[PDB]
Amino acid sequence: AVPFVEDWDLVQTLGGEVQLAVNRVTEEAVAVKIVDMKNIKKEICINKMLNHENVVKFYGHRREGNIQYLFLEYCSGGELFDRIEPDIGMPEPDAQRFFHQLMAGVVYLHGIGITHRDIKPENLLLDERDNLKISDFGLATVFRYNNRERLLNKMCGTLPYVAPELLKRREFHAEPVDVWSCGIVLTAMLAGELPWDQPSDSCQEYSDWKEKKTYLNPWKKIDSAPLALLHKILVENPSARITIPDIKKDRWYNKPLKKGAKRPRVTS
Numbered sequence: 208a209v210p211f212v213e214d215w216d217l218v219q220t221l222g223g224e225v226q227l228a229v230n231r232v233t234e235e236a237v238a239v240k241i242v243d244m245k246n247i248k249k250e251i252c253i254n255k256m257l258n259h260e261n262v263v264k265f266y267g268h269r270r271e272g273n274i275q276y277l278f279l280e281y282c283s284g285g286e287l288f289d290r291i292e293p294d295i296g297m298p299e300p301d302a303q304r305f306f307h308q309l310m311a312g313v314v315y316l317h318g319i320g321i322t323h324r325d326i327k328p329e330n331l332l333l334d335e336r337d338n339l340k341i342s343d344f345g346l347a348t349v350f351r352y353n354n355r356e357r358l359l360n361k362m363c364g365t366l367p368y369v370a371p372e373l374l375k376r377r378e379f380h381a382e383p384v385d386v387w388s389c390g391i392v393l394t395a396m397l398a399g400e401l402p403w404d405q406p407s408d409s410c411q412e413y414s415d416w417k418e419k420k421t422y423l424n425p426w427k428k429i430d431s432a433p434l435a436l437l438h439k440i441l442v443e444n445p446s447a448r449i450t451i452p453d454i455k456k457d458r459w460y461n462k463p464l465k466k467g468a469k470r471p472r473v474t475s
């Protein structure tokens with residue numbers, strides 16, 4: 208009925224490319240990913256399965272001609288990457304809260320049999336209230352179907368965040384790989400630096416971690432409680448690595464640290 212409701216104005220580049228679109232009538236804002244096709248089909252397929260408060264919502268897609276348009280939830284708070292101060296990190300309570308949200312989105316994805324495969328702060332967006340949303344399903348894949356798990360063998364992700372088994376073994380389970388990358392995200396949030404270029408024995412920093420030299424750089428800035436959690440996540444053997452139900456029972460994970468979002472108040 209309402210005439211111009213279908214019209215959106217592209218008002219600025221978000222990050223092919225991602226543009227912030229504003230509805231001509233309602234002024235509602237959305238993110239539109241523009242893909243110059245000249246992959247996307249699986250990405251759209253995966254996005255259509257997604258419905259969770261900590262995952263970037265998918266509204267629909269349009270094909271036009273050669274250009275695909277994916278309409279996505281707009282996250283006005285930007286990337287988590289931008290909340291991390293170099294060499295510093297961010298306050299521990301904030302990092303714990305973003306970590307709880309990340310785990311909720313991850314548990315959700317794993318519950319529907321989807322692995323993200325590229326968890327890193329650039330792909331973790333923040334809404335108006337600083338709620339974390341996992342974004343970008345371009346590298347994602349189905350690891351469980353009809354209740355049968357399928358082992359992965361494709362190498363993908365981003366080196367500093369990738370699990371050591373991706374570099375060492377021909378086949379590997381999907382879930383511990385996403386867990387590992389969440390541990391590197393946590394390290395980055397608490398230390399403002401990535402511990403190594405890649406998790407290989409040839410990598411000095413990685414070999415120092417395995418030798419437990421936690422008096423060295425990233426680790427020394429941490430704090431014993433979250434550092435004990437990182438000792439359980441960044442375990443080389445994916446079979447020994449802590450799983451999410453267990454992360455949820457971790458001492459630091461459950462430590463009260465942060466006050467809820469402050470709400471207006473007066474005195475009399």
Ligand SMILES: CN1[C@@H]2CC[C@H]1C[C@@H](OC(=O)c1c[nH]c3ncccc13)C2
Pocket residue numbers: 221222225238240263279280281282283285329330331332342343
């Ligand atoms: C590294 N990338 C850049 C930024 C996040 C990840 C995937 C892609 O953005 C989106 O898909 C966004 C969806 N909703 C958004 N709201 C605000 C900014 C980006 C997006 C491009």
